[model samples]
Target: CELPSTYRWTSTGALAQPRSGWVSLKDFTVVPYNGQHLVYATTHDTGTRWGSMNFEPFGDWSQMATARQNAMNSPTVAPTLFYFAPKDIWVLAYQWGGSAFSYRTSHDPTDPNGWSSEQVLFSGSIADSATGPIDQTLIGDDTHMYLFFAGDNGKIYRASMPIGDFPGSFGSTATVVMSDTRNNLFEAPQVYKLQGQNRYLMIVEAIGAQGQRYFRSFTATSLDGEWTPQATSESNPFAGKANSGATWTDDISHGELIRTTADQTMTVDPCNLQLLYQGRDPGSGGTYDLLPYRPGLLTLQR
Candidate 1:
């Protein structure tokens, strides 16, 4: 599980992305809940949504029902979800427009109904960089929970609170943890605790020289430790067009590592790293908004 020398990934198959109401499914984050895997994501048209599927990477998913969506406000996007074990409620950390980071809680995420309305975490004033911090992902240590997000200005940021002070204790603003030129570290930052090790691994979605998207990685000894470059460029990217053989889409955009545990720590079993990501046909280019992004799978070819 330690970063393999010659990383190779192959498509397991494409997911059955939602159609009809939520046509272009983007930012698919998955967590194991109860006896199934609960998949949460945003759409090009509607607000964020929730659906459930089994562990099979190629299986279809059940889209959110209207009754559940009725509980949420209109037009929210890029949701990061997990089960907050302390509160015993499901938590969704997401961006509410360009305004601030907001959250919603549900006692039962599988049902699609019991969600709370949007509540604030931090305002746009805090992360006032390029287009104001987008794509927030969360992970925790034994004592702290950290929020990792990105900006269009080529930076990845982090804001943390004591483990007990989560959704309520995130500070006034986020601090920059990693950066590069605007294209090198664009967005979608995901941090994971490599189960059984004292270290952590992170992947940030970035744009290549040709404007195609890929993911680069970083490593840290602790949640608050300095992130050192493990894989920082296109030539040896953790996942890029070169390593990803025969693809459904050209770019490996926003997605999540299918996790080992679904709780706040956001742990991953390194030996079984399977990524569920957003991608599109090469023809589905032009506007960033309506490019018909869909879910695709990549399993580490061990």
Candidate 2:
């Protein structure tokens, strides 16, 4: 399938805001259930506080503070949420303490306090020339489940494990899929299967020439297949200032495409697409963790 074309705000404003301890919000992942959207995000506030909640397309997301509130589970960064059908539990994956790739689980994803204990996928293993490996995400074919992430240095990485031993199966190391300058293939690697097709899509956050963040796309025939770039440049990004009506943020930052199914496959419908992303005021200036990033939703117009 060809890449999607353009997008517009689902509404005129941000879909999510910062809760009490969550002064800054970014790195979003979404799933749909019972006609509502369930979202999980990483809050770069005083510490590593991740949260989750449910909201409709254009409803009052402000009421979600209580749902997105979290205490702590080892100060995670870049959280990814999905259902593991085989275990009948929802899995939350993230980098633990900005070091190890770790995760937790829940039966009811809508409940912010229902997640299980922390479990590490891998730790202290950064690829060569990489600052570190963060923003861990998961997808699977019939026999194996794959882990995809970005090395802030210059490459994207991948790892896999047998389907039956997930949440604890991946070994201590990963290999580079592809690499370039740092901004070309940065953090927040989200991989998805195209609905009813053999193709898979990946969207990784990239920094533009002028220091703004956008998305770059890659396609592969299968989960373990080699990825080929589709839109890997600043001038022809998959999602950026040129293609999105994002008046509030100069950087698209980290984002997720709403999926067709809530299962471990991480599949998208391809026909209908919505990009749930994090961005801040174009003029806002501060250190990385303190910048006030809010969540916005973009609906495909093409």
Candidate 3:
């Protein structure tokens, strides 16, 4: 697939605001469920929070439950959401205190409170906040569930388990799938397979030497194979538009591809997908303030 020229906001204000005193509303993940949008996001005031809204009617998201950690009770951050087709369940993968990769599963994804206990996928033994490894992204195919995450080592690693086992079973160790010789600081890696194609697209949040944050893309043929950088396309500190006038928030970052579906299970279609990302006012000053961070959408230009 080819990359688009520009990314603009689809709406204005934050998609869902934080409760009372919460600050830093960030790291959003969404899925299409039964004609509605199911979203999970991270809030500094709380461990995690969820809500649902109608994209068709574009109504205000109905506030839902907030909880800390998985049912097993491991505190988490940077939550990533995906649906497991074979098991007919929803999975949440997250970083445990910026140390390890952990996850939980939900039998009823539509319910904000439905999830099992937390389980360790990769402990900090392999990599930690200093040396590398943070921000886990899980993607699955017909036979195996593939997990990809960011590492300070300037590379993205992949680990896999069978489709049936999912969050319960993961490879003992992760293998590096893509790397950078320059060893630039980057994180928040997201991988997506275009619907009806064998190709894969990997987008990462790149931190420049000057501390500027943006995005870059990579492509590969197989899940665990060598990845080739998409050098010709526009890749920089920002992938899409933010705060375009009064329509949406400015400064797009940490976005995920979403598919709109009406099926019993959630699905993401790369062919007709849209990016659900977090945005903040470009001119904000407060560091942990939640009001500055909001969610916005971007789609391919016609």
lDDT of each: 0.74, 0.74, 0.58
Tens digits of lDDT, candidate 2, 108-202:
77666677777877665775644577888899889999999877877888899898898674777887888888878878889999887789989
Instruction: Looking at model 3, report the run of 10 residues with the lowest lDDT sum.
Output: 50-59
Clashing pairs in 1: none
What tens digits encode model 1's per-residue C-alpha lDDT throughout 1-302? 67675678987445665555654777877888665567766765544343322123212334322213221334447878788887687887778543568777878765444557767766645344646778888887788888888887788888888878866637567778887888888888899998888889999998998888889989899888799888878878878887877367878889999888889888898888888888888877566666677777788988
In model 2, the Cα lDDT at residue 75 comes to 44
TM-score of each: 0.88, 0.88, 0.76
> Cα RMSD (Å) per model?
4.1, 3.1, 5.4
What range of 10 consecutive residues in model 2 has the weakest lDDT sum? 51-60
Give model 2's clash tally.
Answer: 0
> lDDT per residue, candidate 3, 16-128, as tens digits?
54445554556666676655566666655533332222112222343322322222224346777677666666777777543367777777765445567777766634544
Better of 1 and 3 by TM-score: 1
The count of backbone overlaps in candidate 1 is: 0
Q: Find the 10 residues in a row with the least total lDDT in model 1.
A: 63-72
